[PDB]
Curated annotation (Swiss-Prot):
This is DNA gyrase subunit A. An N-terminal fragment (residues 1-523) can be reconstituted with GyrB, but the complex no longer has negative supercoiling or ATP-independent DNA relaxation activities, although it is capable of DNA cleavage; ATP-dependent relaxation is inhibited by novobiocin and non-hydrolyzable ATP analogs. The fragment has ATP-dependent DNA relaxation and 30-fold improved decatenation activities, unlike holoenzyme it preferentially binds supercoiled DNA. The chain holds residues 779 to 827 of 875 of the full protein. A type II topoisomerase that negatively supercoils closed circular double-stranded (ds) DNA in an ATP-dependent manner to maintain chromosomes in an underwound state. This makes better substrates for topoisomerase IV (ParC and ParE) which is the main enzyme that unlinks newly replicated chromosomes in E.coli. Gyrase catalyzes the interconversion of other topological isomers of dsDNA rings, including catenanes. Relaxes negatively supercoiled DNA in an ATP-independent manner. Negative supercoiling favors strand separation, and DNA replication, transcription, recombination and repair, all of which involve strand separation. Type II topoisomerases break and join 2 DNA strands simultaneously in an ATP-dependent manner. It is found in: Cytoplasm. The gene is gyrA. Heterotetramer, composed of two GyrA and two GyrB chains. In the heterotetramer, GyrA contains the active site tyrosine that forms a transient covalent intermediate with the DNA, while GyrB binds cofactors and catalyzes ATP hydrolysis. Can form a 2:2 complex with toxin CcdB in which GyrA is inactive; rejuvenation of GyrA(2)CcdB(2) is effected by CcdA. When the enzyme transiently cleaves DNA a phosphotyrosine bond is formed between GyrA and DNA. In the presence of quinolones this intermediate can be trapped and is used as an indicator of drug toxicity. The enzyme-DNA intermediate is also the target of a number of topoisomerase poisons, including toxin CcdB. Few gyrases are as efficient as E.coli at forming negative supercoils. Not all organisms have 2 type II topoisomerases; in organisms with a single type II topoisomerase this enzyme also has to decatenate newly replicated chromosomes. Belongs to the type II topoisomerase GyrA/ParC subunit family. The lineage of its organism: Bacteria, Pseudomonadati, Pseudomonadota, Gammaproteobacteria, Enterobacterales.
Length: 49
DNA sequence: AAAAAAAAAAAAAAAAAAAAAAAAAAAAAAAAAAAAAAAAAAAAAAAAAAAAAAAAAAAAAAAAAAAAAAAAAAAAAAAAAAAAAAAAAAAAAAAAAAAAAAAAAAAAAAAAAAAAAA
């Protein structure tokens, strides 16, 4: 897509754990995973960084 | 023959070092277990190969979570001042091969001496 290019990382997570992500240019963040709903292997949703 | 420096007399100031003996620790150098790594054998799971198949991307289309707009408000990060940590550049150095000067052994031959023959 215009926004999405290449799949990067896959992490298994429960419904109350956080996902910390990093960017190549000295940027990161810590997000709560409650606010995103599972979907069936075909879709694009929420931009977190 | 003039200048300069060493050394020695005797009361003063002030320092430095080598070993013995026992018992414990701390460096520092070795054999020797012990496991990576590598060479050279047989051996055996994976790709190949082929036929056969059915599970998920297309396609229609609603709708429901969404990313831009608007607003208010909090305050992370960036650049400018200073103040420390830590590493190349350059120069210096102590043993260390090279050279030169003095001590001990060497015999050739003779002065002086000691000793004895007729």
């Amino acid at each position: 897509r215009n926004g999405l290019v290449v799949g990067a990382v896959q992490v298994d997570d429960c419904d109350q754990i956080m996902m910390i992500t990093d960017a190549g240019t000295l940027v990161r963040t810590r997000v709560s995973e409650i606010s995103i709903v599972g979907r069936n292997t075909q879709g694009v949703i929420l931009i977190r960084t």
